[model samples]
Target: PRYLKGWLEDVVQLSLRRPSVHASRQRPIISLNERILEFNKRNITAIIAYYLRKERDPIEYAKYMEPYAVGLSIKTEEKYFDGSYEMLRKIASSVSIPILMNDLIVKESQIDDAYNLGADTVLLIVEILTERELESLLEYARGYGMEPLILINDENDLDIALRIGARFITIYSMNFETGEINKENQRKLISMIPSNVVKVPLLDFFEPNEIEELRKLGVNAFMISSSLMRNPEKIKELIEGSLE
Candidate 1:
């Protein structure tokens, strides 16, 4: 449930990134942006935060999911999550869905990596960053034509999230609570949200009943990571079931 000074060092190591760029310092995912406009036609949308532990063909997987997933989240952190700029670049070139640069982004250069690699969105973890870092990173991502999704783990973070003018805010509970208490608090945060910002909640694990429950609580978009990372084929099952 927690990783402080230990993980902090690991993340700092992530900061000294090897500089590289893709061939095209080009445009955002056109279809994914258009998809958001077309959301009026539906209620629930999913952004798969693809966190891989081994070598898997993400491009093919991304292609396979294009019909259902509105966006694709690539864990760009070089360590911890088995992520790399190469994987991010390859997936972007092959797929049209919006690419969310999923990383422990602590500096502007990391945003530059995501931008140059042709990603459309970046993940900003509220707990890991300072208030100034969070605000500045949000500004930085927008400057590069990338929407930043702010991940808030606690109710106290809501004020900072709103203050930063976050367009997409994700309510995530880092604690490994096996019972309903986690959902109860997440629902409390979900209910408190104003309609001005899009509601994106992070689901490490999901079930059909829980999916419907989240919808009832105003979660219009879901960002899924762990479960899908294990069972890639489960995406279809979810969309076919409660996600429709």
Candidate 2:
């Protein structure tokens, strides 16, 4: 029972990002909106206020939005419910960049919240819900003119997302409990993904060098968190850290 916890900590300790390194010139060709391309040119994006429950300071975090970041993703977990909608709404209104509402949504009503809050996109995790739920939410979100992003962790998850006609998917490379990245499996999986689909690899905990490696492997974009949050002072450094 506790072995899982120990293993997770051990792996997480080893998951610290390695030094920055450059990859080849083989950047994947994919479709993207003007806003997304702004950050795509930089090769990485930042996540903001993920621990919303513990911290409700959007104004402070909002400072990290422009110039240094191409976009912002707001995560409102169950543990943090102190004015999530209001907090997110303020951030979206204040920032010129696109905002993604990241949550474990299970109902249609939640989509309305995302729309009203001015979110440019909503997250759809395939592992937690049924096929019907995924399709309904996907279609409903599209109806509102908001992009639906499917989050997947495994091959079967990818299959369901693809079959449902998801245009964007975020591949979670690291394990939840163990904090370990299935690097080998992820490489194979990324290679198998169709080029038409937008592939955004969520680096659970990865080095700068790894980002270039993934980009060369046909990954269109990358989702980075924690690292930037943990090192707020190095915002510009992280943004410019990626190889041009």
Candidate 3:
């Protein structure tokens, strides 16, 4: 057994360090690995800017990342992830892989926006919605031409997730008090999910052997949330005003 922490801890650790800002995007680039673990290190648009300055589209970043990531999960939640639709627009147009917009989805309009912005999928967390809303959102997502990746955070969510006829689902659990992954709960919940649906184990800080355990449990698909490469203040300087 080992101590497992949430993305917040890693983000906190990295942000505690003084950022060495460059004079311009043309200067020496930060290695992706350094930028990766810090989910709060916010500036994907900056990362994209780095590539654009190299005479490349953000898709160039995608191309380098494509082989490793089954799908690209773009968090368009401006408050937390510092993401925006425009970022999705630019990257989606050029990337070959499917893009999943990871946001706090509660409105049909959000689905419409996600589809219009070129997202192939959107997340629907069970914790934050009612059963009726889940059904409607599921319907809206399908009719809107976007895949609804259902998220199950508890037993109630599991039932609703399956009852909603979820084809693509992710099983994840967290202790809000501790702000950490609950291993036993995750293990028990994962076993209940049948093999017919595409299962994505929560992609956080699990180690290799732990992931192998998940793989054995019939986990076949996973989406790499850009949390693997988190980012946004520079959005004003690099993305929103220009890059059109």
Q: Top model by lDDT, which number? A: 1
Question: In model 2, which regions exceed 4 Å deviation?
Answer: 1-34, 37-56, 80-83, 174-181, 233-235, 241-244
C-alpha root-mean-square deviation, each candidate: 3.9, 11.3, 14.6
For candidate 1, list the clashing residue pairs, or say none: none
Total backbone collisions for each predicted model: 0, 1, 3
Candidate 1's TM-score reads 0.85
TM-score of every candidate: 0.85, 0.74, 0.66
Candidate 1 per-residue lDDT, tens place, 1-244, comes to 1234666556665564545454565665443333553662564455554555454577777777677777887877666667788888888888767888887777787888887788888888787777888898889888877668788767878888888787778787555233122666787888878876777777778886887788777666777766776777877776666544
Candidate 2, residues 119-221, lDDT tens digits: the string is: 6778887866787778888999888776677878789888999999988777775566555767777777787689877777765456768766887887766
* Model 1 bad stretches (over 4 Å): 1-4, 16-23, 31-34, 47-49, 175-181, 240-244
- Of the candidates numbered 1 and 2, which has the greater lDDT value? 1
Error of 3 at 29 (Å): 33
lDDT of 3 at 170: 69
Whole-model lDDT, model 3: 0.56
